[PDB]
Amino acid sequence: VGNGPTFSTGGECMNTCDIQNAFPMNDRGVRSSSP
Amino acid sequence: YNMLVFRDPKRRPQLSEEERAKVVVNQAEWPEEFKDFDPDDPYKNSPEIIKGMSSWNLFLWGVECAFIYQFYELVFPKSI
Amino acid sequence: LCNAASKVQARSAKKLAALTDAGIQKTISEHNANGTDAAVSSTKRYLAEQRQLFHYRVVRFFDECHYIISGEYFAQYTKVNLIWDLRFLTKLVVLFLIGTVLGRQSIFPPIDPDSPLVEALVTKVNPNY
Amino acid sequence: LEPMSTWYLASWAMVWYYAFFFWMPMVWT
Amino acid sequence: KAAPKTLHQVRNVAYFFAAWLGVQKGYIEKSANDRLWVEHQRKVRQQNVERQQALDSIKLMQQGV
Amino acid sequence: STVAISVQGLHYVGTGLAAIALAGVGLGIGTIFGNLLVACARQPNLTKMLFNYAILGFALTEAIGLFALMLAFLMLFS
Amino acid sequence: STVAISVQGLHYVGTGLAAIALAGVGLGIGTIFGNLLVACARQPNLTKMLFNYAILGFALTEAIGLFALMLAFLMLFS
Amino acid sequence: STVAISVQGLHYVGTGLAAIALAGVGLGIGTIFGNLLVACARQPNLTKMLFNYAILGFALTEAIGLFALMLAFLMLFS
Amino acid sequence: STVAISVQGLHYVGTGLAAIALAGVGLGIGTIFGNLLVACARQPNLTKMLFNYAILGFALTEAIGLFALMLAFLMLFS
Amino acid sequence: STVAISVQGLHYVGTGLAAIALAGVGLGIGTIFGNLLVACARQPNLTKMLFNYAILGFALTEAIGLFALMLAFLMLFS
Amino acid sequence: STVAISVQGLHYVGTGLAAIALAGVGLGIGTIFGNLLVACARQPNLTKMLFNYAILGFALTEAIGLFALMLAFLMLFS
Amino acid sequence: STVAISVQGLHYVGTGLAAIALAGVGLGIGTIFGNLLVACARQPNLTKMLFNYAILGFALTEAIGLFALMLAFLMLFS
Amino acid sequence: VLFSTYRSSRLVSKEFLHGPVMRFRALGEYYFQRAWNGTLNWALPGEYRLYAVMIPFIYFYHRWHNDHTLDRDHVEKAMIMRWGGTLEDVRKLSAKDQLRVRCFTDIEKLYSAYGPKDTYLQPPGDTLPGKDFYR
Amino acid sequence: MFLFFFCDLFWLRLLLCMYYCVWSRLCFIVYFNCLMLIFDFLLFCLFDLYLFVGLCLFLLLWFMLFNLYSLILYYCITYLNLYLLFCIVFLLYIAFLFLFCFLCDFFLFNNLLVGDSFMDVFFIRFLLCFLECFSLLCRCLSTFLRLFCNLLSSHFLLLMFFDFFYFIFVFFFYGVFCYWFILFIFVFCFCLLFYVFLYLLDLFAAILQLFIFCNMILQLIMDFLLFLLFV
Amino acid sequence: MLLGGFVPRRFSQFNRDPCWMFFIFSVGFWLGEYPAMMIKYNARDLVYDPHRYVWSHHDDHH
Amino acid sequence: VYTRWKCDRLPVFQLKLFTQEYPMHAAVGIFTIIFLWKHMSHCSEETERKY
Amino acid sequence: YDHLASWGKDAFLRRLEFENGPLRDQVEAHTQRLLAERAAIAK
Ligand SMILES: CCCCCCCCCCCCCCCCCC(=O)OC[C@H](COP(=O)([O-])OCC(O)COP(=O)([O-])OC[C@@H](COC(=O)CCCCCCCCCCCCCCCCC)OC(=O)CCCCCCCCCCCCCCCCC)OC(=O)CCCCCCCCCCCCCCCCC
Ligand SMILES: CCCCCCCCCCCCCCCCCC(=O)OC[C@H](COP(=O)([O-])OCC(O)COP(=O)([O-])OC[C@@H](COC(=O)CCCCCCCCCCCCCCCCC)OC(=O)CCCCCCCCCCCCCCCCC)OC(=O)CCCCCCCCCCCCCCCCC
Ligand SMILES: CCCCCCCCCCCCCCCCCC(=O)OC[C@H](COP(=O)([O-])OCC(O)COP(=O)([O-])OC[C@@H](COC(=O)CCCCCCCCCCCCCCCCC)OC(=O)CCCCCCCCCCCCCCCCC)OC(=O)CCCCCCCCCCCCCCCCC
Ligand SMILES: CCCCCCCCCCCCCCCCCC(=O)OC[C@H](COP(=O)([O-])OCC(O)COP(=O)([O-])OC[C@@H](COC(=O)CCCCCCCCCCCCCCCCC)OC(=O)CCCCCCCCCCCCCCCCC)OC(=O)CCCCCCCCCCCCCCCCC
Ligand SMILES: CCCCCCCCCCCCCCCCCC(=O)OC[C@H](COP(=O)([O-])OCC[N+](C)(C)C)OC(=O)CCCCCCCCCCCCCCCCC
Ligand SMILES: CCCCCCCCCCCCCCCCCC(=O)OC[C@H](COP(=O)([O-])OCC[N+](C)(C)C)OC(=O)CCCCCCCCCCCCCCCCC
Ligand SMILES: CCCCCCCC/C=C/CCCCCCCC(=O)OC[C@H](COP(=O)(O)OCCN)OC(=O)CCCCCCC/C=C/CCCCCCCC
Ligand SMILES: CCCCCCCC/C=C\CCCCCCCC(=O)O[C@H](COC(=O)CCCCCCC/C=C/CCCCCCCC)COP(=O)(O)OCCN
Predict the structure, then answer these.
(1) In the Cβ-directed half-sphere of F72, how many Cα atoms lie within 13 Å?
(2) Where does the sequence pass through the membrane (chain D) (predicted)?
(3) Which of H77, I40, M92, N57 is the most buried (most CB within 10 A)?
(4) Cα–Cα distance measured from residue Q6 to residue B1, given in angstroms and rounded to the nearest whole number
């Protein structure tokens, strides 16, 4: 796989941010870094 | 671990103990860079950027640069 | 005075046991069984090898000189070689400066008799130094 | 102390005024 | 683990300690000499001041105010 | 007769006096944290909120000590 | 005899003495925030209202320090 | 012998000493509001009356501060 | 007449005054620990978070004492 | 005119002032032990941990006292 | 010009200032023996342990008192 | 030039400074008694025990006052 | 009508200097466009290597500027005032003498307020030249 | 007199151009309270209460590029002048105040007359109004003075301590080879601890002072905001 | 914000990343300039300027 | 869609920003600039020599 | 992001790919087991 960047996060944890619901949650329970 | 104020990030576990115990580890598939992987020293086997260039060599290079900066005028002084 | 010595010995023993080098552990075990010193033996082995490799160094020096003079070294020149050459030049300069300082046996150039700074030499607090 | 000085205060403040009127729009956009 | 047949490490430590003690002796001697010379220079300056004061006093008497 | 005298060393005295202002500031800061500890033990659920208010108070109190320290530098360097 | 003397470094002393007044202001501010921290833990629901009064005291307490600070400049620069 | 001396620079010292009186006024105000915050949490239903009394206390302390400043300004000029 | 005077030993006086600034700093630190004991006694499970805040308060208070101490040593060597 | 004066009794005055700071330290010690007793009564089970923390507070406060004391002795013999 | 002056009576002033350091030391003792009564009344069963700690605090404060007393006497007979 | 001066009225000033130490002694005594009343008014059956400890504290703080008084007398008669 | 107020009015082609610009953007993006590179108000990044690289460089160029442009003025003033009060008088000295003087100035800088005061205060009885030597 | 000079941000401007030619998210802000003025829902304000956000962010960026990087030795705070900071704070504070005053709503100032009708109007309430009107300008002055003094004092202390450390390190390191090496080692360790402590304190204090600088302006704005309730 | 990045475990690993290589070079410069100053400014042959009492910054700023 | 920051060129956006977004701030800044250049734009020869 | 392909992956990027790649479960299990063993040895 390549070395390219992805959707920026700003150094934030999406499982505790104020807009966490906007980030989908996967099976493991970790909210995505992007929509 | 820490190097001054720089702390090494650690990945949070995602698997439960029950699921984790069922995982079969096969280091044969792992890259040669990361074998016997240790969280406290993950870059022990990491390749050098320049072959034969040690950290001490760069430290000594900087020390020599400082010595030159401070002593060049002693050997080749110039008039105002 | 004794507790500190015991603590230092224990720490060194723990660190010695910690290392996972098969050769180092094997040598340590052999020397402990024989009661000899591993570090001194390593030093003697290194000195013997260097003594037996002097003419190898000479031959390598001549081979490298031929390689450089022939122009083959510059044919495959890369950025890494440039970095190494810059390191080499820096060491040459610092060694030259140190050699000059040692040659004149003084950090600063000596003062000529006709210079106006001679007074400073006369007014030394301690003439011995 | 220059920080308490005023003999070239106007030229000194031109830096802030340039930053406010010319550099802030660029940073904004 | 048999008894050591050689005492190389202790000898090396003793070598270092002996060199350090010699360094301390030399440093003490040099410091004492420096203090002596500093005191001597101070005395020389004091004597020069006294001589200048005496010369000024003689010149004042010659002035005769 | 009219005599004008300019004593240089007085600037040290004024500088030392300003430093005394730090005694109140240093004490005042300790008072804030003393209440912070006695408050976190009365309602630990707000410890993070209280810690934030304590820091704000520290700076305001600290700010005053700087005013005095500025005068010390002004006279010490003039 | 009539003798007039002008000592030209005394304004340093007056400036330092005025600066000492800042110790009380700094202490008072620390007292205010100490009471604030120990008061919020008692009635957290009114935390915000208390903060507004705390700032008001700071506004009415820092102002006094300015007068003393004002006198310092009027004597330091004269 | 009778010698009369007139030092110009002694009014700075007097001005500084008078300015020190504000440290008490500043601390007194801090005490007033520190208790005000405690009282409001205790009985928040009386916030307005307590605020009114605190203001009255601040006014009286401020009046004393005005008297001290009046002396400071008088000595500074006169 | 224009007279310039340079008093040497005044730097000792100014240095001593700055040392007084450590009186409040020392008192302030003692206040923090005293409040710490009460908080621990009234909430024994928080023996570490309170301890950390006490250290933080000491550090800030120590900083103020060090700001004054710099002047104390500086004037002593001026 | 340029006049240089060296007063040999002002190394005493500075020394006395540096000793005043000890009061802010000595009082600080009493405050820590003043509240240690209350804490022990409140929570006798923690007679040990509180004592250790009090010792830490006393040592740090004493550290300020000795920093000031160093200035006191330096100016006494110089 | 170089002028050396030796004021003899200033060794008294330095002695007096160091005595002020006892003000805090004496007050600090009162604080210990003030809280001790409250602690004893609250928990009379622990008078012995509290009394021992009170003595400990008194000794520590007295140490500082002797330090100031030492300086006062040295500047008195020197 | 070497000039030796002996001011005879300075010993008065040093005496007054030592008297200030009594302020921190008398106040400390009042603090003990103030806490004594509260301790007595909390559990009055222990008055006969607390009173002895109260006297002990007065016996120590008063002893400190003697040291300041001693200096106030030595400098006042020497 | 003369100049457009819209940024859409292009002045060059889309492919103008595409390659160099892509190289520049590659340099910019490799270390900065990462999840762990979260800035504090755009000024303090999260990547450690950015600090490790930029702090030394900033210090180096600032120090070079200070040593070769700012302190040089003080050094030259000291040399001129202590050895004639004129530039030609200083140039009358040799390079070694100038080196000695400048190193003494560095000594004075290092001592500052924490060092012996005989470096600028002439003790009584000293035979060295005074302030009125050249007057 | 016209002096031509330059700020000390050219390398930082170059870095900003290099690293911000492409977009990046921002999630950490020194003063976040400028974005959340209203905490109770259904409350809204007809006044442009979010006008300060852009100026707040730009001021934070500018002051952070200067102050935080000033900890690096020989880095210059080009704007460090008392009256220049006065000009900056004057601009911001007076601009917002004149925005409130141009509204030509005099009732907005009713709260200046402190107290209730019970208090004597002339001898108590009027004096309090005078004091509060004075206190607004005093708040402006205190803001700018605090910002100036913090930097000045911190950098003076850093310079003095660094000078002392250089002196002892250069002219007393030989004690390592002498019999009093322990004293030198203790002093060196203390100096290292002091160095680290000072750097941490300055780093924290810069950010906190910027926070307070913006909070004073926001408090000025909030003192005159009125919120309506949705129905 | 100090969130992440390469962090060498010990000195020997500083050569595993170019940025840390430059960092260790700079640290070497920083620490080695002090011994150089010790040697240069505590030298036996170093002599104070004879005319050091002719002028000083202390008189100028006074 | 049209946005000032994305569609307008830099001078136009600057004018819009300081005329319909922060006009009072610009006015105050101009006032202060005029004051500075009217009362703080002179330096005597003695002042230059001193500082 | 083709223009970045020439830069490759550094040590940290390789570590992240290794830990969070398809072998992430194996690496997590190995790391947790090693940490548990070290903690048990410490106690
Ligand atoms: C102005 C001009 C003046 C000119 C004067 C004349 C000049 C000389 C002319 C010639 C004269 C005749 C020849 C004489 C030769 C003498 C030397 C010699 O032959 O040595 C061989 C000899 C070993 O020979 P061997 O026994 O046959 O070896 C058998 C095997 O080969 C062993 O093999 P190995 O495997 O062991 O190999 C390693 C071995 C071999 O390595 C070497 O060969 C080393 C280099 C040899 C030459 C050394 C010359 C020294 C001369 C003086 C110093 C000059 C600078 C030297 C720089 C050396 C840099 C490495 O390493 C060592 O020797 C180690 C020594 C260091 C031990 C360090 C331990 C310190 C512990 C401290 C603990 C403290 C705890 C306190 C707790 C208190 C609690 C209350 O080694 C030594 O004698 C070593 C001496 C080292 C002295 C160092 C002194 C430094 C200054 C003092 C310290 C100050 C800083 C630190 C202070 C810290 C606070 C306390
Ligand atoms: C008499 C001697 C000469 C002097 C005469 C002066 C006359 C004065 C009249 C009276 C004025 C009274 C009032 C004065 C108040 C001063 C206050 C003050 O200074 O405050 C500090 C304050 C400092 O602000 P700052 O925070 O440092 O930021 C301002 C910077 O400029 C950076 O801010 P920024 O980065 O935000 O700026 C935007 C920047 C955005 O970034 C960039 O664009 C990057 C570039 C930056 C350039 C600007 C920085 C300059 C750096 C230093 C100089 C660079 C090297 C120059 C080499 C000179 C060699 C001799 O873009 C630009 O700068 C746009 C210009 C770009 C020019 C590009 C030219 C390319 C030519 C290519 C030719 C190719 C030919 C090929 C042919 C082939 C044939 C085969 O200054 C200002 O705010 C500006 C003051 C200006 C006042 C107006 C003065 C009148 C205009 C004078 C023009 C003279 C032109 C003739 C000179 C000829 C050579 C001798
Ligand atoms: C369909 C046609 C197809 C044609 C295909 C052609 C293909 C082949 C290429 C054609 C040939 C090349 C064309 C030009 C390329 C230029 C570079 C480029 O590509 O830029 C990217 C870009 C390419 O265009 P685009 O992306 O397609 O479209 C642009 C957007 O539509 C709108 O852009 P924007 O609005 O977003 O931004 C525009 C501008 C914002 O707008 C402006 O700045 C425009 C207004 C500026 C006015 C400044 C002066 C004001 C003075 C005061 C007023 C005076 C009034 C006087 C009244 C009369 C008095 C009598 O933005 C900036 O300022 C940032 C960019 C700055 C660039 C960096 C400049 C410095 C580079 C230095 C490099 C060399 C260093 C030294 C090397 C030394 C080696 C030893 O071009 C621009 O962004 C244009 C920048 C223009 C800057 C002008 C600055 C002038 C400063 C010097 C003035 C000298 C006056 C002397 C007076 C003397 C009196 C005595
Ligand atoms: C052709 C142009 C227009 C001609 C005139 C048209 C018809 C009249 C227009 C309106 C006139 C208003 C009259 C006053 C109204 C009341 C206000 C007041 O009291 O005013 C006092 C005084 C006027 O004196 P006065 O009351 O008429 O009576 C004379 C008294 O005897 C004097 O008594 P005093 O004691 O007050 O005297 C002290 C001193 C007092 O003088 C001052 O205080 C000067 C203050 C200047 C204020 C400038 C306002 C605009 C600021 C924009 C933002 C800049 C940010 C910072 C940038 C820094 C880096 C450049 O007075 C003077 O000497 C006045 C000289 C004024 C010269 C104005 C030159 C402006 C240059 C702007 C440069 C911008 C560079 C940007 C580069 C960007 C490149 C990317 O100052 C002003 O009025 C200043 C504002 C003038 C505005 C003129 C119209 C706009 C500008 C047109 C020229 C643009 C040139 C661009 C060159 C670019 C080169 C690269
Ligand atoms: C969010 C918090 C950020 C915290 C960052 C912490 C950084 C930790 C640094 C550890 C030590 C680094 C040593 C570097 C040595 C360099 C070489 C040298 O000689 O320097 C000596 C210099 C000075 O050392 P000195 O004073 O001993 O120098 C002696 C020199 N003589 C004798 C001539 C006087 O070192 C420094 O000044 C380093 C101080 C660093 C303080 C922290 C600064 C943080 C703010 C800037 C961040 C920049 C990030 C930019 C990123 C991009 C932005 C878009
Ligand atoms: C070493 C000494 C140190 C001393 C330090 C002293 C402090 C210095 C602090 C400087 C930095 C802080 C500055 C903050 C800003 C201060 C502002 C200030 O006071 O400026 C006042 C000054 C007053 O201006 P002035 O000084 O020219 O006043 C003229 C008055 N006469 C003619 C009587 C002398 O403002 C200006 O300088 C700007 C004037 C032009 C802009 C305004 C024009 C419109 C005026 C409207 C009313 C009149 C006209 C009729 C209505 C309109 C009709 C069209
Ligand atoms: C308005 C002029 C009226 C009088 C006639 C003058 C003609 C002078 C001869 C000009 C020959 C060269 C013309 C080259 C094409 C110019 C195209 C142009 O104007 O483009 C403007 C373009 C900017 O475009 P945008 O803002 O992105 O948007 C454009 C679309 N809305 O500007 C540029 O790039 C600069 C181009 C400058 C070209 C030269 C203009 C010279 C004008 C001189 C006028 C004065 C009279 C001259 C008399 C000359 C007699 C011999
Ligand atoms: C040709 C070089 C040979 C090297 C051999 C060195 C042997 C030295 C052994 C004794 C050393 C201690 C001596 C103690 C007394 C020194 C006094 C002094 O300063 O004298 C200087 C000599 O000092 C120097 O020049 C050297 C100073 C120190 C040099 C340091 C060397 C490198 C240290 C690296 C440190 C890096 C960190 C290591 C940490 C390890 C310990 C924790 C000469 O001048 P003086 O005539 O005394 O008077 C000058 C006044 N006009």
Answers:
(1) 32
(2) 7-28
(3) I40
(4) 31
Question: Any chain N CB within 8 A of the CB of O30?
Answer: no
Q: Does D1 contact chain F (CB < 8 Å)?
A: yes
Query: Under DSSP, is residue J57 helix (H, G, I), strand (E, B) or coil?
Result: helix
Among N27, B5, N23, which residue's Cα sits nearest to residue A11? N27
Range 23-62 of L in CB contact (< 8 A) with K: 23-25, 27-32, 34-36, 38-40, 42-43, 46, 49-50, 53-54, 56-57, 60-61
Instruction: Name the phi and psi angles at H7, rounded to 5.
Output: -90, 125
Specify the DSSP element, H or E, that contains J35.
helix J10-42
End-to-end CA distance of chain E: 99
Q: For N91, how many CA atoms within 13 A lie in the half-sphere containing its CB? A: 24
| Experimental determination technique | cryo-EM
Is residue N49 within 8 Å of residue N37, measured between CB atoms?
yes
- The Cα–Cα gap between E1 and N188 comes to 42
| Separation CA N218–CA I52 (nearest Å) | 32
Please report the sign of the dihedral spanned by the C-alpha atoms of residue N197, residue N202, residue N203, residue N208: positive
SS3 N229: strand
Instruction: Find the CB nearest N142 among G55, G60, G66.
Output: G66
Residue pair O14/B55 in contact (Cβ under 8 Å)? The answer is yes
Tell me the C-alpha to C-alpha distance, in Å, between residue F20 and each of E32, F26, G67, M83, N214.
43, 10, 18, 45, 30
Query: Could you give phi then psi for residue K6, rounded to 5 degrees?
Result: -130, 105
- Report the alpha-carbon distance of residue M111 to residue O33 in Å, rounded: 17
Q: Is N44 helix (H, G, I), strand (E, B) or coil?
A: strand
Name the β-bridge partners of H6. Answer: G4
The structure tokens listed for N97 are: 């105040």
| DSSP code, position M86 | S
CA quadruple H18, H20, H24, H30: dihedral positive or negative? positive
Residue found by looking up tokens 């390190």 in the block: N169
Report the first-to-last Cα separation within chain C, whole angstroms.
40
**Ligand 4, closest atom to CA P36?**
43
Mapped onto helix, strand or coil, the DSSP state of residue K6 is strand
Sorted by sequence, the CB contacts under 8 Å of residue O38 that are 6+ apart come out as N170, N171, N173, N174
Q: Report the residue of chain G nearest F51, measured CA to CA.
A: G37
Residue A25 has what DSSP assignment? B
Residue among N58, N29, N34, N61 at smallest CA distance from N48 = N34
Q: How many CB atoms lie within 10 A of CB F36?
A: 32
Residues I11 and F76: their CA atoms lie apart, in Å, by 11
Q: Measure in Å the smallest separation between the Cα of N175 and chain E Cα atoms.
A: 10
Amino acid at I15: T
Cα C120 to Cα C115, I42, M132, distances in angstroms: 10, 72, 19
Secondary structure class of Q7 (helix, strand, coil)? helix
Per the DSSP assignment, residues forming a β-bridge with N228 are N44
Pair of tokens at residue P14: 């600057």
CB within 8 Å: O47 and C117: yes
Strands G2-7 and F2-7: parallel
N110 burial via Cβ count (<10 Å: 0-12, 13-18, 19+): exposed
DSSP per residue, C61-97: HHHHHHHHHTTHHHHT--HHHHHHHHHHHHHHHHHHH
Q: How many CB atoms lie within 10 A of CB N63?
A: 24
Distance CA C112, CA M94 (A): 10
CA dist list (Å): C109 to G62, N19, N170, O41, O49: 62, 50, 22, 14, 15
| Structural contact between residues F3 and I3, judged by C-beta atoms closer than 8 angstroms | yes
Nearest to C123 by CA among N112, H47, O48, Q1: O48
Q: Residue C126 is encoded by which pair of tokens? A: 């301690």
**Closest by alpha carbon to C125, among E46, O48, E28?**
O48
